[PDB]
Write a protein that binds this ligand. Structure first.
Ligand SMILES: CC(C)(Oc1ccccc1)C(=O)Nc1cccc(-c2csc(C(=N)N)c2)c1
Ligand SMILES: CC(C)(Oc1ccccc1)C(=O)Nc1cccc(-c2csc(C(=N)N)c2)c1
Ligand SMILES: [Mg+2]
Ligand SMILES: [Mg+2]
Ligand SMILES: [Mg+2]
Ligand SMILES: [Mg+2]
Ligand SMILES: [Mg+2]
Ligand SMILES: [Mg+2]
Lengths: 5, 236, 236, 5
C-alpha cells in the first residue's frame, strides 16, 4: 500500500 | 459518556500513558472523552486524538483486508464452499471499522470543525474528515458509495484550499494532507494521473521552500517529502 | 453467552480466521464460545484456545509492565507529584488482565479439566491453569498472594507428575510445561536454583530421547529445548 | 524476560 500519515 | 466523570487533564494524561503502553483503543476512548468536554484542542491534543484513532482504524483496515482476500478466494472457480462464516466475520470487522469512522466523523461534526478557525486546526480536522471518509470508501459497495467518495473529496479539497492560502508549502500538515489526498486520487477515485501530479507538485514546491527553515523544521518537512517520493516511485 | 447461537464448527472456523487477521480478542471470544458448547476439545482446538488467550494476556502483561514501571518511577525520591492517574490506569489494566485470567481459569474449572483423561489433554490444561495463576501472581500484592502462588505451583506440579509418568521426555507439551514451571520458580517463587536444575535436567533428558524421533518430531522438540537453553544462558 | 510457551 502507499504511504499516508 | 463513560468518561464524563473524569477531568479533562486526567483524560489527556491517561491518553499519553495509553500510548506508552501501546493501548490505542484506551487512548482513543480517553481522547474522545477529552473532546466531549467541549473545549477546543491544542496542537498536542489534536495529534493525540489522531494518533489514537489512526492506530485503531489501521488495525481494523489490516484485518478487513486479510478477511476480504480470503473471501475473494473462496468465491473463485473451483473453491470449496465453506459456508457463510467468512462473509459474516468480514462483515463483523467491517461494521466495527465503520463504527470507529462514524465516531471520529461525529467528533469532527460535534463540534471540532465548526470551532476551528486557525489554519493549523482547521486544515488538520478537514484532513481527518477526508481520511475517515476515505476509510469508509475503502469498504463501501452500496448505493451511497459515490456520496461517501464525494464527502472525502470535498473535505480534502476544503483543506487543500485553506492550506494553499494560509500555510507555507513545507508545513507538515499541508504536506501530509497532500500525501493523503494524492493517495485518495490513486486508490479511491481511480485518478492515478491526478495522484502523481499532486505528489510531484507538492514535493517540488516544498523543496523550493526548505531554505527558509530551521534544522528541526527541515527534518519534519523532509520526512513527509520522502513519503511523497516513495509513492511517486511506487506509481511510476 | 453471546456465542450461544453460533454453531460450534462456525466458532472454530472463525477463530482460525481471527488468528489470520491477528484479531486475538475475537479469537479468544470465539474459542470461549466453543468451549461453552460443553464438548471436549481436540488437540487442534486446545491449541487455538491457548494461542488466543496467550496473545490477549501477553499484550495486557506488556502494558501492565510499562505502567508499573512509570508508577515506580513516580514514587522515587525527587519525582514530581502527578496525581492518582498513573495508579488508576495501571489498576484499570490490571483489573482487565485479572478478568481474562479468571475467565480462562473458569473455563478450565467448568469443565475442561474434569473431563480431560488423556495425558495430552490433561497435562495441557493443568499447564494452562499454572500459567494463568502465574499471571495473576505477577500482579498480586495482597492477602491472597501466597495462595495464588501456591495454586500455580499445585497445578504445575500435578501436570509435571502426569507428564513424567505418561509422556516421553521429548514430548513438546512436557517440555513447554517444564520450561514454564522453571520460569515460575525463577520469577515467582524466588527459587532460581530450582529453576536452573529443572531446565537443565529437562534439557538433558530430552537430548537423550531425540534418537527415537522422526525428523518432524525432532524439529518440534529441539525448538523447545533451545528455549530451555536460552533461559539457562540468561540465568548462568 | 525469560522464554515461556
Ligand atoms: C506532522 C507529521 C510530520 O505528519 C503529519 C502530517 C499531517 C497530519 C498528521 C501528521 C507527524 O507525523 N506528527 C506530528 C506533528 C506535530 C505534533 C505531533 C505530536 C504531538 S504529541 C504526539 C504523540 N504522538 N504523543 C505527536 C505529531
Ligand atoms: C507444542 C509447542 C511446540 O509448544 C508448546 C508446548 C506446550 C504447550 C503449548 C505449546 C507449540 O508451540 N505449538 C503447537 C503444538 C501442537 C499444535 C499446535 C497448533 C494447532 S493449531 C495451531 C494454531 N496456531 N492455529 C497451533 C501448536
Ligand atoms: Mg473539570
Ligand atoms: Mg457491510
Ligand atoms: Mg492542481
Ligand atoms: Mg449445534
Ligand atoms: Mg488491583
Ligand atoms: Mg526434581
Amino acid at each position: 500500500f502507499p504511504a499516508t500519515v | 459518556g463513560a468518561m464524563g466523570s473524569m477531568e479533562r487533564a486526567s483524560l489527556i494524561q491517561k491518553a499519553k500513558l495509553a500510548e506508552q503502553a501501546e493501548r490505542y483503543e484506551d487512548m482513543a476512548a480517553f481522547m474522545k472523552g477529552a473532546v466531549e468536554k467541549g473545549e477546543e484542542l491544542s496542537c498536542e491534543e489534536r495529534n493525540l486524538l489522531s494518533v489514537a484513532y489512526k492506530n485503531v482504524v489501521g488495525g481494523q483496515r489490516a484485518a478487513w483486508r486479510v478477511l476480504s482476500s480470503i473471501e475473494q478466494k473462496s468465491n473463485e472457480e473451483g473453491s470449496e464452499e465453506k459456508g457463510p462464516e467468512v462473509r459474516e466475520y468480514r462483515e463483523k470487522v467491517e461494521t466495527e471499522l465503520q463504527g470507529v469512522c462514524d465516531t471520529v466523523l461525529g467528533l469532527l461534526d460535534s463540534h471540532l470543525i465548526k470551532e476551528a478557525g486557525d489554519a493549523e486546526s482547521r486544515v488538520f480536522y478537514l484532513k481527518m474528515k477526508g481520511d475517515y471518509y476515505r476509510y469508509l470508501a475503502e469498504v463501501a459497495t452500496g448505493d451511497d458509495k459515490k456520496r461517501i467518495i464525494d464527502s472525502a473529496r470535498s473535505a480534502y479539497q476544503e483543506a487543500m484550499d485553506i492550506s494553499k492560502k494560509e500555510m507555507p508549502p513545507t508545513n507538515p500538515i499541508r504536506l501530509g494532507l497532500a500525501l493523503n489526498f494524492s493517495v485518495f486520487h490513486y486508490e479511491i477515485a481511480n485518478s492515478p494521473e491526478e495522484a502523481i501530479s499532486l505528489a510531484k507538485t507538492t514535493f517540488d514546491e516544498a523543496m523550493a521552500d526548505l531554505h527558509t527553515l530551521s534544522e528541526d523544521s527541515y527534518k519534519d518537512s523532509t520526512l513527509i517529502m520522502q513519503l511523497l517520493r516513495d509513492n511517486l516511485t511506487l506509481w511510476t
